[model samples]
Target: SLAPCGLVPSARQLEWYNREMIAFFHFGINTFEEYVNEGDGKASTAIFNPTALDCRQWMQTLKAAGIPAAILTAKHADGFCLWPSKYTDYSVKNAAWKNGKGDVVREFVDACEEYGLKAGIYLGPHDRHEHLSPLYTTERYKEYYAHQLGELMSDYGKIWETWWDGAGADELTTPVYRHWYKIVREKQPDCVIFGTKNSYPFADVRWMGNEAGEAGDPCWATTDSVAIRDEAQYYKGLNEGMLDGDAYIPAETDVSIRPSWFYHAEEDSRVKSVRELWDIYCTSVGRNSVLLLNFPPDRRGLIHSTDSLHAALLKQGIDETFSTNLLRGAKVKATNVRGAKYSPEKMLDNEKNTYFAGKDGEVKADIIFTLPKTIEFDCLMIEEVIELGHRTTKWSVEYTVDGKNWITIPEATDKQAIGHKWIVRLAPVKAKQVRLRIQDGKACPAIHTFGVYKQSPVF
Candidate 1:
């Protein structure tokens, strides 16, 4: 359990971390209706059946979509292990699938190796929703937990990382927590652990919050929530004021394809659409963080047909958008003649709502804009990679009015670096503009694209 000491990681680490994107599988009680009913009612335990569950097929689909790593919730907060652990009977062992003869974690690990995918486990500490003290302090409970963790660590040969979630009890007498994490490191030295509280025994990644994975200014290890549309506001409050960090920590934006985390016969019709998955991808991966998508297995210890169909389409969307490369030797030019506020609302539909919003400060980008006779000014958008938690300074936004003079806009303050737009107001000047200039005197910005916007609101 090495400490980052709250220090920012080096540039090399940031580059390496940024290159590795993640996809998550939240196949547990949450995938079922159990999690949603915790505060309301109890769900049936026999609801865990996944008829067409194939870990190999899942990994192969992700591999084909260009995902580097995958993480599965071996046990969610509900305390059910998809694999039958020798420690407890609250797992797939009693499920109808495989006739209580299947080992999901074993198959999961094997499939990861077959596809050369980095395997990671997300172990939930908050099992037994209503029980707390006895679970973490009792030796028997500790042994049970350790047995499951040990099984995952030892069986999943060469695990890339392990994600530990904190949702159950306080951190007072959970001594076994650190012990289990230490064993994971001892087993896999290079394996990274996602930190939960004030960091864990072997924590490397910081869970920023429950939703939206980007670390601002100074970066820290972070994970997002499973529900994006309806539950975002609830999850956003988990880490409201502590998102801005300055480390080379990675992030995982987790969500589920089905309505619930676990299987529910009644809620199968509420699964997310392909459009929703695409939106999540654009928000997470497009904004420079990895995405973790959950596909739950039903009571039969298998993925439900409806959920599998959604996952398949999700895989297709990932392939269609991410598998192919569009950025190569790309260059940009800018026009218009004003400040940092550029509205692409008219030029582009609000359907592509994944683009970052411009802050109340100056903006700049290096690009050229093609202007028509009617729309006098030129607006463009670009991305900047400011290390987590640090602010951008000493930048200039300039555009050509007559292909000669480059009018530089004012400097920007402590604003976001990504999804920034530039607007040039052409009051009286009417010229065929050609170029834009973004001078980063002190910082290097991450640019994605530059395009001319229309003049009508198309939201």
Candidate 2:
């Protein structure tokens, strides 16, 4: 057996990858502003009221949508804190909400626990409230940010992810990340940190270069911190991870269900359609990245009706498409096998830990599946024995009815390699037999599993 490559995801990252789809709740003071840059105690503390505020409602919608985890904007660039923070007056402590007695953070975390969804917090560093302070020295600001962060980390039961916003951090955030991160790990070591390259040796995940929620063709999980610094380089790196990256920082594709990250009454009609969410899902979760789809709550502090509908349908669409693996009952054969333990049948068991590997020094191989009967499928799923590293750099899927003549599945085939997972989207194909050809790899191809699915109405 081959040993895992030089780099692999940590326990936390592995847990994250398993969630393929997670939700992002972009709530807080931003919901009141039509635009941002007002975190400096200027945004009205009077308008901060959600008459129907219900974290359980949000959790219910998320649970119905098959989302396992969520992250709330405990504090965006806006200085307002969801939970009353002792560090400042610009928080729920002074807000008019619940007559200044409500705490969104407490409700959010507790609701997640009740619904069995992992909860997380988003605290951006570009605090517009802190930006204009004259008394703000790097030391004082770090101390304040540290204190605020400590409250969120220690007070919250379990935060699975911590998002440190990178925008507006250019000159002001340089000296704070190292200290903030120290405070973050001091209380929570199991959570994944998504921040700028400055978080370097510690960034557990990265933002997919674009906010449009698209994962690059070959989104590798490994990358060098220096490459993540150059905006242009980081853009490309976020899309297609550096194949030879030195660190295993996976990408998280964050995008809102609406045109804006925060809820706006004007955009109430612009919520993404179910089909739109499905396509975004294909590109993000389908392309080796986790989908952090956001649903900004309106002033009522509840998910907008349209956003809630789409979120549920997106899960239904996903379930309709992938609930069954067409190859589960298929008789399989492989071109090469390491032994019975790594046989072709292991790939059909739907077990992630079991996989088929070629003999030592073998760089290329193929596995053919003869289904019980002809099946129609539009999406194909493939995974690598990731613990052993993403070794299969190039491959193709071909199908045939007679098992004599074969044709390659042409759509959505351009990609770098299979990392944790890869879903090939193609036209609905009718075939009785299919072949997965591993054409190239840096090491022996270790195919953990394969799946056949049909996502409709096909786009």
Candidate 3:
């Protein structure tokens, strides 16, 4: 398949892609039962008290793990608000914590700013309490929803992302989003709204199919694929991403650190290992998509020690594995070059802004690397200068022990679409020469980097 041309991401979308990794703080009333979405308005606000509530502790732990931002589920389906909202009596304001004066949202945003992290909020649209209200008419609900959203938008310092989970209420329409969108634009113009299913038109980011923590191998940022109203079809395309589309909606892989979305004492020993998390990193971020990892806080209102330790170790493993590029200054030769301006060496210059391009109208080209000496490597990393858009659809890697006998290295060939970054891991092999062949593409292929690495096992 030929690659798509002129499929660049929007400025805001590009900014989000650069963020790469985000954390989801799924702390709420459900934490008590560890229920997936049991937000039945019956839970008492008094049960929400966290004896040692510390928002800073959560943010600090995530920061140490190299996550740049976090999203707090301020209000889940349970109808219990994390902050005191004049619109409702079922909130933290009625809780015994801090003598009915606690604001989880306030403290969460403050902690994010204190730790230099971007803040995001997940506000569930379905309100179990509101569902039972005498004035739960459509218009009335819209006003009530707008009021609460206004409070969060106006009060928080700056929200980087606004997430809306479509698990509640009849699928909402664009009008409902218009109400919330106005406030988001007025208060935080740079913020992006994420939605699923019918909410895709209003959303800037698309849910990447499932909660399994993986993206489709050949994840494409551009697609005509919109959120399917049908539940089955919608999920089917989640991991497939958009093979061919006009819209520039990118995929975001969201998965919990443990088996459940909320903290459960019984699952403490089930926290994902560093190896599991690394595999997710390779599948999501490595496949040119963003990863949103959930780390629910325990009853103590903090990331569990087990989860925190694994997160830190995962970050450490990533840093140690890709610290040095084996082909940092290796010699490079390409089958085609647009001009003197687009040199193959630009790909090895350790700079993203500079890239190497094939001659105009030349889609099939090859770039070979000759190391100073034989080197052993198990990984190959490739990236497209996405600012120019994703152009390479089909490609392969090959290495040579004796420069003349080139051998093709196996890849997840079926769905390998190198957009921003594609990390391929194979058995370690010593080679003096490596080559990347652009077997198929739309226009000339423009690649930002062609690198090699030897990753150490995280387990």
Model 3 error, position 209 (Å): 1.2
Tell me the TM-score of model 2: 0.96
User: Can you give the TM-score per candidate against the true fold?
Assistant: 0.62, 0.96, 0.95
In candidate 2, which residue ranges exceed 4 Å CA deviation? 34-41, 172-175, 412-414, 457-459
Angstrom error of the Cα, residue 298, model 1: value is 3.8
For each candidate, the alpha-carbon lDDT, in order, equals 0.50, 0.82, 0.81
lDDT of 1 by residue, 32-52 (tens): 454453322133445556676
What does the lDDT come to for candidate 2?
Answer: 0.82
Superposition TM-score, candidate 3 onto the true structure: 0.95
- RMSD (Cα, Å) for all candidates, in order, is 9.6, 1.8, 2.4
Assess the local accuracy of residue 88 in candidate 3 as a C-alpha lDDT between 0 and 100. 92
Counting only residues 3 or more apart in sequence or on different chains, how many pairs clash (N, Cα, C under 3 Å) in candidate 2?
3
